[PDB]
Amino acid sequence: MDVFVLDTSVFTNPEIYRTFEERGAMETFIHLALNSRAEFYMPTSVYTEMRKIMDVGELWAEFEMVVKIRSPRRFQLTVPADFLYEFIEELRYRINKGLRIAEEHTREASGCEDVGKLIARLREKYREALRQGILDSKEDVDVLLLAYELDGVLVSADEGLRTWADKIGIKLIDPKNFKNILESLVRH
Amino acid sequence: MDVFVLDTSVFTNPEIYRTFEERGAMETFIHLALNSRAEFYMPTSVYTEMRKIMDVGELWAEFEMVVKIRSPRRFQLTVPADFLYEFIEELRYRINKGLRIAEEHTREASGCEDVGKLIARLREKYREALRQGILDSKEDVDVLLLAYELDGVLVSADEGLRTWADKIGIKLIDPKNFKNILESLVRH
Amino acid sequence: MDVFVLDTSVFTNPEIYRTFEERGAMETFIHLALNSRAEFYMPTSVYTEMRKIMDVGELWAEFEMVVKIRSPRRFQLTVPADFLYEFIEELRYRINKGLRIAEEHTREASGCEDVGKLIARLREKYREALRQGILDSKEDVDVLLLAYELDGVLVSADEGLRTWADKIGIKLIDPKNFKNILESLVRH
Amino acid sequence: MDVFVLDTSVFTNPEIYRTFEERGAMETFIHLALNSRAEFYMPTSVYTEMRKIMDVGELWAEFEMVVKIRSPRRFQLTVPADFLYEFIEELRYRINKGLRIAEEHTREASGCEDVGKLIARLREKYREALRQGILDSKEDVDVLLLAYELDGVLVSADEGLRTWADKIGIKLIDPKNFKNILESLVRH
Amino acid sequence: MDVFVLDTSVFTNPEIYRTFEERGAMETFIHLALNSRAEFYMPTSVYTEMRKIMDVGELWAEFEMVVKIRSPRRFQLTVPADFLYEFIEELRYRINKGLRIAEEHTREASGCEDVGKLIARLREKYREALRQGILDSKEDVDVLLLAYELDGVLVSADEGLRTWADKIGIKLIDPKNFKNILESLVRH
Amino acid sequence: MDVFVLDTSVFTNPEIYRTFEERGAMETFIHLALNSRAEFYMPTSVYTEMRKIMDVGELWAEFEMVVKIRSPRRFQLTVPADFLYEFIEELRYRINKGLRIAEEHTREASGCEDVGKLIARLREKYREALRQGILDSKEDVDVLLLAYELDGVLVSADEGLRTWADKIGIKLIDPKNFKNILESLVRH
Amino acid sequence: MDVFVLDTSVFTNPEIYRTFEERGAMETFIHLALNSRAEFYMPTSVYTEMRKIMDVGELWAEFEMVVKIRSPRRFQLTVPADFLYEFIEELRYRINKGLRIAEEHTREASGCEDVGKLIARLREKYREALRQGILDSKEDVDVLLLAYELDGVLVSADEGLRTWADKIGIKLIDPKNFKNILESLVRH
Amino acid sequence: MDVFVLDTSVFTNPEIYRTFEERGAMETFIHLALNSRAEFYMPTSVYTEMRKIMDVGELWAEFEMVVKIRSPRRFQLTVPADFLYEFIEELRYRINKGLRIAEEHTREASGCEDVGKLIARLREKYREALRQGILDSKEDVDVLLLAYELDGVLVSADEGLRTWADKIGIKLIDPKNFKNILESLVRH
Amino acid sequence: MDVFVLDTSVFTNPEIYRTFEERGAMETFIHLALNSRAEFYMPTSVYTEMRKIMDVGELWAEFEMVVKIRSPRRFQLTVPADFLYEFIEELRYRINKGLRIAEEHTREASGCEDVGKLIARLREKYREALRQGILDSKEDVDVLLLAYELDGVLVSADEGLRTWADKIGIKLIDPKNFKNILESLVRH
Amino acid sequence: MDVFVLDTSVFTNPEIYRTFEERGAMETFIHLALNSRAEFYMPTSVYTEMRKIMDVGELWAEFEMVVKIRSPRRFQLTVPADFLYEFIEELRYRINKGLRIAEEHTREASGCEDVGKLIARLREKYREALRQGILDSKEDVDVLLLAYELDGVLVSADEGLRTWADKIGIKLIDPKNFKNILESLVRH
C-alpha cells in the first residue's frame, strides 16, 4: 500500500498535537500506525532534531518499531536544475528584504530607547523575511530527498516545504486530515 | 579545441579590466578571441546584467559574433543531491551570522548618534556575511549549469563560484592568467 | 517482517550484556529471537572473532538455528566513491594525530623514569587517536556490506560504525533499546 | 588517442625531475605534451597541493593550456566493495605495526638521553610503517577515481598507488619511461 | 523453514558416525530428519559415490523419502571470476609442493631399500600436498553449486570445502553440532 | 576494428620468435602493430612474468605505447558453473596420474643408482602429467578473463589455453598465422 | 507433499509388475496411492501408449481418479541448449554403430542360408545399437518435460531416461524401491 | 548492417563452389566479404571439420581476418521444448525406416551373391533414411545456436538445417543467391 | 479435491443419458454430485444452450445448487499462439473439403431429380466436413477457457474438443467412465 | 525508426501493383526501401506462397537484402483469449451462411441445366461467404504474430486482416498511401 514520509511537523506542532487524540498523541498515533501495513519513513536528521527538541519517556520503542529511520541515499539521487535555479532566485529577494528590515529597525532603535521590544520585533520580522516560505534548514531537504526516491506521500505542516515539494513532483497529502486518513485506511 | 564559458567577472572587474590591454579591453579581447577557434560561451542572464551595468558603444557587434549567448537548457540537466545539501547547510550558518551582525549594529546605533557611518558599516558587514562565499544570485547558477553540460572551462574572478564549481566537477582555469593563456593558445 | 543485521557489539559489551536479562543473556536473547520471525543475520568474520573472544558451552546450537551466518557476497556489491573519499580524508588526520601523540609521549618518557605507566597511557591515547571513530577492522566493513545488500536494520554499539552506516544509506536502530524493541515486536 | 592521468609525482620527484630534460623540465614537458593530441588530465586537489609545494613563475599558463584540471565527478562513480575490504584489512596491520614501533622508541628514549636523533628516527620509522605502501592522502584517491572513469593511463612514481590501481582495473604505465614514451608518440 | 544441503561427509566420517546415536546412525538421522519439515538436499553424484563406498540394507527407502536427490541445474548458475582466479592461483602452489615431495622421496628411495614403507609415506604426503585444503573432486563442486542456488545451509566435515563455500557467500553451519541442531529444531 | 588479447606465448616461444622477422622480433612486431589501429591488450600479470623471464633494452617504450596493460576487472565478470565443474573434474584425473608416475619412479630409483637421470625424467613426466593440457597458472586465467569481457581475439601458443577458451565462448585465432594476419590487415 | 511423475515403465515391466503385490498390481498400487495425498501425474501420450499395449477391465476408474493425466504445456517450457547438443552428438555415434552392424549382418547373410535366425539377431542388435541408452520415442520426452515444470520426482525403469533426466536437473527416485517408498510414506 | 552466420556447406559443396567465381572461390569470396562491413561468423567445430576435410595453402590468413570463429556460448541460450519434442518424434520414424531397409537388404544379400554392389546400395539407402532431412551431426546444432543468439542470417545448402532453422525463428537466406547478394550489398 | 468442468455433452447425449441411471439421470447425477465436495463448474453459455435445447421441470434448483455457472473471465487469460496457428491451418483444409463436397452434390443434383434425399445427404456430409473434428461453436471455446484457468478436469463426449484440450494442457477424463468415477470418489 | 511488417498483398494486388511505379514495381520498391533505414519484415510462409504464386527473375537478391524473412517465434507469444472467442463466434455464423448458399444453389441446379455457370456462381458466393472478412489462411495469422511482437506497422490490402489486427492492438497504416509514405520518409 501507500508509503508515508513523516516529518517533525506532524507530532510536535500544537494544532496537530491536538487533533491527534490530544504523550498520548504519540501512543495513539503509534497504535493507529501499526495497523494496515502503511509503511512510514522518517530521516535520521529530522529524528535527532525532534528528539533534541521534544522527549517522551520509554515510548520510543514502538516508534522505532513502526516509523523507519533512513537517510536518503543522496549518492544515487538527482534534482532537476530548474529547481535549484528557482530556489536561489527567490532566496536573493528574501535576503534583500531582510537587509531592508534590519536597516529600518536600526533607525527605529536610534529613534527611541525601547531596545528590548524592538529586538523582539526584529526577531519576529527577520525570521518571517527569510526563514518563512522556502526550504530553510537541512532537515527539510532531507525530507524532500527521502520522499522523492521512495515515491512516498509527504506529510508536513510546513508551508515552505509544500510548494517546493509540489515543484519537484512529490505527491502531497492534507496535513490537517492525516489522522482521519490513517484511521479510515486502518478500518476499511 | 577547448571551449570557454565566460562570465560577467572577466571584463568588468577592475583588475581584469587592467590586465586586458588596459573600451580598449573589450576590443583587444575580441580580436584575441576571434583567433584559433577557441569557442566561447556566455549565458543570456549574465549578458543582460552586464549590459545593464556596463555599456560600450557599437562594439557589441563582434562580441555577439564570437561569444555565443545561450541558456543552459535546464530541462535536460541534473545536479547531484549532495551539492544542494551542502549549499543549504552552509547557507543556514550564513543567515545566523547575518542576524547576529544586524543585532550588534542595532545596539551600536542605540549607543551613539552616528547613523550614516553605521549604516555604511552595516552594508559592508551584511554583504560579507551572506553574499560573500557562495552562489548568491541566479547568474552564477546559470554559469555553472551552462559550463556543466558543455564540459567547458569556467572563467571567473568570483571566489564563491570557484569552490562550488570545484565540488560539481567542472574544470576551472586561472582567472588572472586568462589573457596570457588566450594569447599563447592563439600564437602557438 | 524487518530483518536485523547483528554484530559482535550486541551481546559482549557489558552494558548490553546487562540489559539482556543479565550465559543467561544469550539464551534469553535466543528465545526472544525465535519468536515473530524477525530474521536476523551475522557475518562469518564477526562470528569467528566473537567466538574466539567469548565462548559459551553447548548453547551455540540454537544460535546457529536463528542467527544466520553469511558472507556479504562482495562480488555483486558497489560502494559509492564519495564514501571512500571521506574515509581516507579523515584517516589522514587521524594518522597525523597519532604521530603527534607518539612524539609527545617519547619526550615525556625521556623526561622521567615511569616507563610502565607511560606505556599504559600510550595504549590509551593511541587507540583513541586512531581506532576510535571510524571503521577500524574488517569485521565492521563486513557488517556494513552485509547490512547494505539485504536492506537490514544494523544493530551495533560502535560509535564509529553508526556514522559511516548513516552516510551510506543503511537504516539504523537504537542499540540501547534493542531488547525492548524485540520484545514488543514479539508480543504484539 | 590515449589519455593520460597525470599526478604530482611525475614532475616534482627528483629522479623524474632529472629524466625530464634536467623549471626547464616543466617547459620541455609542456612542449612535448602539446604535440600529437595525447589528452592529459590532473585533479584539482593534486594541483593545489603541488602548487603549494612547488612554484614556477609565469610558466603555468601553458600548463593550464594542456593539462586539464577536473574533479572526478564522485557522484556517478562506484568502487567495488572488495577494494574497500582489502584496504581496511591491510590498514589495521599497518596501525598495529606503527604502535609497536612507537612503543619500542619510547623505551629507547627512556634508556638514553639522545632525544633529537631518536625523534628523527621515529619520523623515519612511523612514516614507513603507515604512510608507505597504501593510499595515504586524498590526492591519491582522487587520482584513482579520475583515472577510473576516463579509462586513462595512470602515471605515478608512488609505489602505494600502483598496486591499488592494479587491483581496481586501471591500466598503468612505466613512470620511468614516460618521457621516452611521450617523445616516441609525438614523433612517429 | 531453513533448507539443509547434505553431503557425503555427514554420515560416513567416523566421528560424525559416532555423534549420530552410534546402520543405527542412518535410521536415527532419518527419524530426526522427517520431523519439523526441514527440507534437505543432496546431489546425485555425492549419492552415487556414497552408496558405492557405503551400503545399508533396505534402509534406503526413507532416505529417498526425506533427502531429495537433485542436480544443481548447472545451466542457470554463474560463479564469480575471482573465485576461479583464487582457486587456480592456489592450485599452482599445491602442484609445485607435490612435485618437490615426489623428488625428495625419489632420493630417499635411492638411499635405502625400504620401498614399501616409503611408498606408504608418499601416499600420505602427496595426498596432503594436493588433495587436502581445496576442492579436489567434482562431488564437492556439485555440493557448492546445489547449495548456492537454493540458499541452503551447507553441512560438511571437509575443511577444504568450508573455506571455498565461505568465499562464495554460502551460509555454513557447525558440522559437529548438526545432530543437536536438528534435535532442537525438531523439539521446540 | 578487431581487438587482440595478447599473451606471453606470442613473442617468447622460439617458433613464434622465428616467424616474427627472426630483439628484432619485438620491434618488427611493434611497427606492424602500430598500423591500422588494431587495438591490442595484455594483462599486467602476464607482463610482469614475461619481463621477469625475458628483457629487452629500452625497446619497451613503444610496447607500452601500443599494447595496453590492464587487469580484467574481475569484480564485474562471471564464469559459468559448468566451466568450473569440468575444470575440477579433469584436474582430479591429472592428480591421480601424477601420483602414479611418482610411485613408479620411486620404485625405479630403488632399483638402480642413476638418480640424476631419473630426477630429470621425473621433471619431464610430472609436468606433462599435470601442467600440460589445462589452465596451470594464474596468468592464463587472467588472459581468459581479460579476453572474455572485451570480446577480443585470444592469441596464444598454449594448447591448454585454447580448449578452455573454446569452452567459454571466446573467439580464437591461429597463433602460427598471426604475423601474416597482422600484415594483411595492415596493408589492405 | 512430494509429487510423483509416473511413467509407463512402472506397472508394465515384469519385475516391477512382480514387486507390486504380484491386475492385482494395479489395484494394490491404486489403494496405496490414494493414501497420504502424494499427488501423482502422467502424460496423456504415455497413457494412450500404455492402454494400447496393456488393458485392464473397469479398474481404470480409480486410476483416472488418482493419477492425473496432463500434457506438459510445452509452450511455456525451455530446455537448455547443451542438452540438445549432447543428445545429437551422442545420436550420431549411435547411428554409425547401427550402420556398421547392418553391414556385418548383410555379409553374414550372404555367407550362409539361415535367414530367420539372422533376422532375429539383427532385431536384437539394431535395437540395442540405437534405441537403448537415450531418449528414443516422444513419450520419454513428454515425461521429462512434465516432470521438469512441476519439480516432480521422476519414476522410471528406463536406463536411457534416467541419465538424461539427471543432466537436466530433475530429482530422481529408485524405481526398484518405489513400492516400499510409497508404503512408508503412507503409513508413517 | 546484417550479420551472416556461415557454414561448411557454402564453399565446399560443388555447386556453390562453381557459382563462386569457379582455391579461387575462397579468395574471391574473401575479397568480396572484406567489403561493406557485413560481419560474418562461423563456429569452431564447423571450422575444424571443414579444414580437416578441405585444405587451402596459406590463404587461411584473410579467412581468419574476416570470418570470425566463435562458439555459441551454450550456457546462456535456451531452445524451446517443442523443438526438441518434434526432433525426437521425427527421429523415431527415421530409425524405424532405417531398420526396415536394413532388413530388406539382408534378405536380398541372402538371395544372391553380389555383396559389394548391395553394400554400396545399403550405404546409399541408410544415409538417406536417417541422416537426410534433420540435424544429423553436432556442427549443424552449433550453427543453429550461434545464429540464434546473434540474430544472424543463416547460410547453408543443407535441406535438413533449413527447416529446423525455420521452426526456431532464425531468418534464412537463399543459399544459391548468396554470391550475388553479397556483391550487390558490396557495390550499392 | 479435484474440480470438474462440466459440459452440455455429459447429460444430453443419449449414451451418457443411459449410463446415468437411465429426468431420472439428472436427479441421480445431482445426488451423486452433492457428495464428497467435488466442486463442479459449467459456463453460462453452455447452460443457456442446454436449457434451450433440453428442459426439466423444477429439478433445476439443486442443479443451480451444485453445478456452479460462471464465465471464464476472458480478460485475464491468454492462449498460446501456436494453438491459434494450428486451429486456422486445419480450418482452411476443412473449408476446401466442404466446398468440394458442395460441388459434387451440385453435379449430382443436376444429374437426377431426387432433390430431397440429396439435400439430406448434403446436410450429413457438409456437417461432417466442417463441424466435425474441431472447435465449432463458442460454447466449446468457453468450456476450454473456463477449464484452463481453474485447472479443472474437462468432461466431454465431443471428439473435437478433446484433442484441442489436449494441445493446450488441460487434464482430461474418460467421459464414458464419469459416472463410475464420481461414484467411487463419493463412496471411498 | 519505424519497422514495417510486409505482406503478400502489397506487391501482387493489381491496384498496389499500379501505384508502385507501374517487375518494375519490385525494383522501384526495393530502391525506395533501401533508403532511410526503415527496417522491413516478412514471414517465411508468406514468402513461399508469394514466390509460388508470382516469380521475378534474378531481382530477388536485393529483396532478400532489405526485406527480412523471419518466423514469429510462436513459442514466446500469447494472444488474448477474447480474440479467439470472437474469431470462433463469428466463424460459426459464416459456416451457417455458406451451408445455406450451398443449399439454394443445389435447388437452382435441380431447376435448370446450366451447370457450368451455376458452379462459377457457387465459387463466387461460397468464397465471399466464408473466406471474405476474417483470417482465412495461416499466412495471415503469421503476419499478425510477427507484427505483434516487433511492434511493427502492419501493411496489407486485406480487409479481413485489418479488423483483426485492430482488435489485437497492432498499429496499422494506410495501404493505398504506402508508396507516398515511404517516399516522404526517404526524402525528408
Numbering used by the authors:
A (entry chain B), B (entry chain A), C (entry chain D), D (entry chain C), E (entry chain F), F (entry chain E), ...: 1 to 22, 25 to 190
From the paper:
Ribonuclease P (RNase P) is an endoribonuclease that catalyzes the processing of the 5′ leader sequence of precursor tRNA (pre-tRNA). Recently, minimal PRORP (approximately 23 kDa) has been reported in bacteria and archaea. This type was initially found in the hyperthermophilic bacterium Aquifex aeolicus (gene name: aq880). Bioinformatics analysis has shown that homologs of Aq880 are widely present in some phyla of bacteria and archaea (termed HARPs for homologs of Aquifex RNase P).
After 3D classification, the particles converged into a single prominent class with a resolution of 3.62 Å. The cryo-EM structure revealed that Aq880 is a homododecamer. Each subunit has a typical PIN-like fold, which comprises a single α/β/α domain with a five-stranded parallel β-sheet (β1-β5) surrounded by nine α-helices (α1-α9). Notably, each subunit also possesses two prominent helices (α5 and α6) that are inserted into the nuclease domain. Hence, the region of the two helices was denoted as the “protruding helical” (PrH) domain. The two subunits formed a dimer mediated by the PrH domain, consisting of α5 and α6. The dodecameric assembly of Aq880 showed a left-handed one-turn superhelical structure with six dimers. Each dimer was aligned side-by-side with β-sheet interactions to form a hexamer of the dimer. In the present study, the structure of Aq880 revealed that these aspartate residues are localized in the nuclease domain near the PrH domain, representing the active site of Aq880. The structure of Aq880 revealed that the active site of Aq880 contains five acidic residues required for catalysis, which is analogous to the active site of eukaryotic PRORPs.
